[PDB]
Amino acid sequence: EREAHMRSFNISRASVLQRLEQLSGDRKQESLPPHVRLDLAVRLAQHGLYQQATPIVDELHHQKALHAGHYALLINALACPRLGQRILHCDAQCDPALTYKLLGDENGEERAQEAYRWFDLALTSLAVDCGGRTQPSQFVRYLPQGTAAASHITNALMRTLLTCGYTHVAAIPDSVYDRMGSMGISPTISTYELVMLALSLQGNMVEAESILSFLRSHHSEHITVESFNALLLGHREARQFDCCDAIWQELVDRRWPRASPLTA
Amino acid sequence: EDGIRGSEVTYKIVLEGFWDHHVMKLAEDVCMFLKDVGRQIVEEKLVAVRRLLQGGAVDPELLAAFNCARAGPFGGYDEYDKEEVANFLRSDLRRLEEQCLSVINRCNVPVPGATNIYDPHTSWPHVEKLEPWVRMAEFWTSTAHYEFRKFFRVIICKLPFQSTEFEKRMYDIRHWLHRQTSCEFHTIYRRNVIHDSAVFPTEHDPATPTTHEHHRMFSFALDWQSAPVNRLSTDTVREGENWDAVAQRLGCSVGELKDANAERETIEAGVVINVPVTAT
Amino acid sequence: QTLQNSAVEAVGAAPWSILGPLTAIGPTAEDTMVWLQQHYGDVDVMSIMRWARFRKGKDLMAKDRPQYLARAAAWIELLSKRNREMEEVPLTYMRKSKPLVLGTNSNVRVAWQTPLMLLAREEGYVFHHSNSSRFVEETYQPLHTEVSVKEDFQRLYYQAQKHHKQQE
Amino acid sequence: NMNVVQRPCIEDGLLSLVLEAVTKRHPNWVKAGVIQTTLKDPFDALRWMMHIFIRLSYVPHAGAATIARLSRRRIGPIGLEPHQFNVPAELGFVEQYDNLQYKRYDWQGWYQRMLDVHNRNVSLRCRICDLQRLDGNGVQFVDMQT
Amino acid sequence: QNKFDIMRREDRLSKGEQDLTERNTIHYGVPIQQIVDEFVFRHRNARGERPLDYFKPFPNFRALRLNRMYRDVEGFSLMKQRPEFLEWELFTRYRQHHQQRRRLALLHGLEPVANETAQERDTRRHRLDEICERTPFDEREMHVNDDEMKVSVETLRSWFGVYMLPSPTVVNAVLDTREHVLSGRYLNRLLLLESVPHEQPQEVLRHFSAEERAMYEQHVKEQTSRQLGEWERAMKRRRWLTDHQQYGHVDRCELEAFPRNNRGNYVETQDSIWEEQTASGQEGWSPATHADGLREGLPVRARRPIFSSSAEQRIAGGPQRAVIIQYHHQPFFNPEPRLVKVAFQCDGTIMEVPISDVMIWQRRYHGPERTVGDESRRYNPAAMRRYVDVTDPFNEKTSNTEHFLDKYEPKRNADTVADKYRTTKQITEIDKWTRYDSARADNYRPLSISHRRDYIRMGYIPRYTPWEWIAIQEADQPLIAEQIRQDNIGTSYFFSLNRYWRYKA
Amino acid sequence: LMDEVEDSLRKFQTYRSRFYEWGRAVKQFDFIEFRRRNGWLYDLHLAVATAEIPAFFNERPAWERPPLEETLY
Amino acid sequence: TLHNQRSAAPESSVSQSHTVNAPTVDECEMLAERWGTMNYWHNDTFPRLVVFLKKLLVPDVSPLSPTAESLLSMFEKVVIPKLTSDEEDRRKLVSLWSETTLQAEAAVTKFLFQRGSFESMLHRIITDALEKMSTLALGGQEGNLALEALKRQTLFKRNDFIQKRLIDVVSNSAYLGYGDSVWQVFFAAVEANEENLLSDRATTDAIRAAWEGVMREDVVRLPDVTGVVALYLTLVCIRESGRLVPEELKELSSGLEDGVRPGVRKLQ
Amino acid sequence: ANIPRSVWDPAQHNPNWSDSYGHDITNRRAWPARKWTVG
């Protein structure tokens, strides 16, 4: 089975690189529409060919074809989902906690640095695209930090940085979050889910439980199963098995949200 | 109820031995075991109860269960809100918290300096005495009277929730039970039972009533079907039957007939239809 | 509609509804396909659309077109995670805190205030919360001034804009 | 007299204002028929408070069953349709296993079967108090004549 | 094996916390029961460490324990770590005073709160101080212990002065033979009336060279320059106004001077301990048990019953403050369900409330008496020399009061020279350590039998099966699939009893 | 995880049908003979001061010397 | 050799549900949406219902001075001739003053329990009157002075109404028995008026059976309810206690329950 | 867990728990009868 999964991933990666080369050979002078280039860069970053996709996103940004959704799409694909799947099935022994640890070695710091590049580009493009509008009222001191696009982009950044080794997993519960606070971006549920996951991976459960307590106290209807999953993972890392049992028991008692196969 | 009387699952362990002091000491050992096990389990239940009280989300399944009845107490159709459902949950979890706290306090009461495990108010669980089984036999020797004896002690654990973990740890006692002592387990637990009015309906008493002949000797095997009696869920359409004609012949409403047989838009003679269960 | 509802409920009837992550659909079928593949690409949108065609054998797209559209859109949103990560309600920002310089009550502690109203962790500010947790700004013989544990950025923006409008 | 306090007196207009506010806060109550803003009868205010109390303290059978399932882990099916009524009952049984002499050899099997068939009894008991609750159709499941 | 794990380990060690690799095994250390039993076994009952009440007939569980310095002595200013002539009696009196303050706070709702800010804490303390100074001091509750003799306020005040135990007039003068409960404010007034990384030694320099000498001097000059620059940064402030964030050299804003990094008042100290524990959750209202100890005058939080003629059974109400009038502890006087006669503060109504609807203020978690606080014991330097009358372990024949017939009694010297020494016996001679004691089983349930004491023990057969043995026996055998008992489907009305013949019903 | 779950299930689980025959002399003697034949393949064995500790010895016969454990009881 | 595992003190046995702590800023902010028992709303030390009512107060509303009140009273008929003499103009002034009067009166009472909505409606009314009178182009600004005076008058009427007939009625938690007296008086009133509520012609069999089902529990634990509903219960039970209490306590009594039950053995 | 935390955790130790020898020594203690002058 491990061989079968490795063969699948290698075949897909080779096909995508062949598409990249064929498209480049065709585009020696002709420029393709922005959407095909966006899709190809997304697929490259998905298969882990982030360094192959930097030129495509750079030229798309210079041509100003990317938008709020596209920047977050690219930053999310930058987390290498297909490569993460291959690592999970092959080298992480199907351990979701170890998958994050094993993904960080594969150009973790360089990939995170380029992710910060994309974050700056996305914020600049959001500011331009939101200042270009006239119907919405002034909010001149609250653009774009007060809009859904900024929060979505920040959540994508945190999701990607989760996979970039320990140096950035320790940052997610840190300057990144304080940087967002100073930037005045309203967090969504996924923000706290990723902060809890980062603290769980770091192995510090006191603050993760404090975050979940804050959610229980204030935002109790938006809590998703990912908070419970992050707590389970973090207690598994810290070897607080009685605590992990307690979370599983409370989750089974509270049928909502629905327990996932990841939780099991 | 509250305090001692209130519970949901009652476990009784009848410990049998050949000597009263044997069974008494075994009862003390099993109590010191179950006290701590139940303390930890009620503790980890109390944590979850407190977490749920602090804040949670309402299950849409639960909200539908509340807004399932056709006509509510107030007039006809009723419409509950997730806030009301959460209030019901809060009330239940508060009473559960009170029961768990009573259990924990009673578990913590007993101390070696002053302990009394035979009082339900002092310790948890408590041991109650049961009359020894004595069988005297008189036989030739000039006659002799010798009696077999077997002493019993019942350990009662009343929990305000079903814990299969506690059931497992309770069942696992027979493996380290004392020498030449046996045990049997009695479980009284609350279980939900449905009375499906469709499979078991209420009907007018037939035109020709049963007489005593139908309840004769060996009639239980020859005269009567086992309950329930099958009621045809499938019907065949007769000739030229209107949509409302079929519903009237089945005693069901046209809307419910449509809901049951949404597959077919129109009815043709000789086709198969699904009679709604509530059809009279 | 959903994003407007979330932005409005953020204040209670906002800047949240200025820029949704969904981009405009181009005026071509190729543009439809590109938009669907780039905003709901985790699933096979064509497969969901084909599956949502029939309901108990009745061809919805052929007879009840609005019903088919609603069913297909709901299925696409359900099966597409990206829609889930795009359709969050804007929550509030949580403050870190440190224990009081002088220990009066362990449940009450000094909060961290965003410059709107110097990294957090260097001093020792960290997440800490419970049902009885209390956040304060402490001065002095202690002197306390209770503060909110929460920073609803969207409500602060909406109220600042209301003040701007009244100044206008 | 220093301990003694004067009983306040309030006006039906203030009561009507507060009732309007309550209906605003809980619109579904008026829709479902629990409350009406009208306050004509002298006992009407107390009648509406009693309806509020009944709504807040009366649990439907299906609800109660689902809640019992959630945190108390009460097993058994839950019926949703109006033709299904949930009856919470007690099932008492016995499980005896041997460890002294009939544990690990040939007689183990038939002795265990004998013990199980001897303890085959299961006692199913239900309270008529619990059976006396509103059906899904709105009529009491078990009335006095039932 | 993982760089992620190595980085986590180093970061956690730098932060100063337990490493997650150290947890790769489970190490339940020797429990306190084990340690205490080992101590008493090695010390042969630790008669020196146990107090007098243990050697008195029929001791309580508090007497059966070993002496410990509990959380009650902490506030006493004059305690000198050793015995002296009246300080222990004065400390006992202060302890009783603070218990009276606790009782008053519980009666009048001045008990601490988990979310108390400093202002709320001080307001609550001020109102409690007013109530405590207004109320008289109860002497009945003052429970002496055997080791010490009852001492009157008259003589204690005469010896220590009047400030130590004041009159209400003295307290009003600071802010008549009467005593009132001490006050934190009063004692506050009384107290106010008192007025370079990587620096190596010379031995390594001896092996070092001279080019490294120049390099090391360069390192240390940079090090000291940085530290001195930071130090003089501490003195340059400019008040750090936010407009320019100015640091130095030309309390306005942002509170500059922010660099990077009463233990004498008895009532205040004990009160602060009370808030500490209440905030930590150890102390607070919890449901009351029959064993916690219920008596007259105990402030309690019962749930007021509501009476309705249409109610098929009792109606519970909100938990209101109330005081216990009586509680028949005898089963024949309280048939099930048990009742408690309690008086509510609002409307002063007296009612018999079910015991389950009653909540007490627990001083700790474990009970069995969690209402009453801890009481520290006296220490004796010569704990080996200690005398108790065997025939009269208690002091009955001694009467504190004076009788009108005492002037006709004979003189006390004749019987003093004989009876005191006859009836007296040193604590060493009242109990003997026997082989039964050596072989006594452990009243608790051990984790696993320990052989530390196997040399002088004999015939020791455990009275409880160790947890290790139980775990082994439980692991050795399997489970039965049906024991789970899940019934989420329903009952088959047509087939379950018409199943196949081989497995038929 | 499924491999480990099945390991745990085969360790701690049996059905009623299995249980009613769970303990036959034939199966148990097969277990014994199999252990003798191959203990080296599956047995784990194939701390010291705990089992090695001097113990008191009653030199004189039981009747002559009331045993200490008997005197305790 | 303490251990290598983490340590946690035993989980507190103090019932957090029954224990009530000091109010927190966010709890007060969400108080309009929170639920709680009558004990929660009438806590002896933290009267959350009083907090909820005070949250409805408009801050910084000074009472009307005699000068302003006299100006308002005289502006209805004295100022209008002074600043104009046209029949139509003075008719319009009188009509708009009567309007503003009735709109202020309706605003004081109509938008109670919703302070933001009250403020918005009042500001809209005042602004509309402002530009309409500006279009009228009255001579002096005494009209603006009168409009500001009426603004203060309306604000103070609302604040005084809510502080007198809402907050002063409930501030005495001790008199209200910390909420439980409310429930007891309700039950007493229902028992007295069963002929009016639960009779065959009073309520339908559904409501009746629901009532017996509620009261038949082993222990009839009372429900925790929203703040507005708690206020409604408190007020209506205050109204009903008079009909039940004897004549000698229908006005003055040392507690709301005093006289409700005859056999209660008090202490003295 | 399998072994309850109350056994090994120092934080959860019962303060009121007593040793295993003192209570039994006290029970074995024999107190001479209160010798009065007449009875």
PDB file of N, CA and C in Angstrom, chain A residues 249 252-255, chain D residues 69-73:
ATOM      1  N   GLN A 249     -14.570  11.978  26.293  1.00  0.00           N
ATOM      2  CA  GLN A 249     -15.816  11.733  27.006  1.00  0.00           C
ATOM      3  C   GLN A 249     -16.770  12.913  26.891  1.00  0.00           C
ATOM      4  N   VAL A 252     -18.266  12.927  23.354  1.00  0.00           N
ATOM      5  CA  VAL A 252     -19.319  11.935  23.150  1.00  0.00           C
ATOM      6  C   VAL A 252     -20.576  12.327  23.917  1.00  0.00           C
ATOM      7  N   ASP A 253     -20.423  12.942  25.092  1.00  0.00           N
ATOM      8  CA  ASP A 253     -21.587  13.438  25.820  1.00  0.00           C
ATOM      9  C   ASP A 253     -22.298  14.527  25.026  1.00  0.00           C
ATOM     10  N   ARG A 254     -21.528  15.434  24.428  1.00  0.00           N
ATOM     11  CA  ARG A 254     -22.065  16.556  23.662  1.00  0.00           C
ATOM     12  C   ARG A 254     -21.997  16.188  22.182  1.00  0.00           C
ATOM     13  N   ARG A 255     -23.038  15.494  21.725  1.00  0.00           N
ATOM     14  CA  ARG A 255     -23.065  14.930  20.380  1.00  0.00           C
ATOM     15  C   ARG A 255     -22.737  15.980  19.325  1.00  0.00           C
TER      16      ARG A 255
ATOM     17  N   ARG D  69     -30.460  10.823  26.443  1.00  0.00           N
ATOM     18  CA  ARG D  69     -29.444  10.184  25.613  1.00  0.00           C
ATOM     19  C   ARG D  69     -28.137  10.966  25.633  1.00  0.00           C
ATOM     20  N   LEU D  70     -28.217  12.294  25.576  1.00  0.00           N
ATOM     21  CA  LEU D  70     -27.027  13.111  25.357  1.00  0.00           C
ATOM     22  C   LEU D  70     -25.980  12.934  26.452  1.00  0.00           C
ATOM     23  N   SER D  71     -26.301  13.337  27.680  1.00  0.00           N
ATOM     24  CA  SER D  71     -25.312  13.391  28.752  1.00  0.00           C
ATOM     25  C   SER D  71     -25.415  12.229  29.727  1.00  0.00           C
ATOM     26  N   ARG D  72     -26.616  11.707  29.953  1.00  0.00           N
ATOM     27  CA  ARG D  72     -26.795  10.585  30.862  1.00  0.00           C
ATOM     28  C   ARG D  72     -26.619   9.236  30.177  1.00  0.00           C
ATOM     29  N   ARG D  73     -26.483   9.215  28.852  1.00  0.00           N
ATOM     30  CA  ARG D  73     -26.183   7.991  28.111  1.00  0.00           C
ATOM     31  C   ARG D  73     -27.280   6.946  28.292  1.00  0.00           C
TER      32      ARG D  73
END
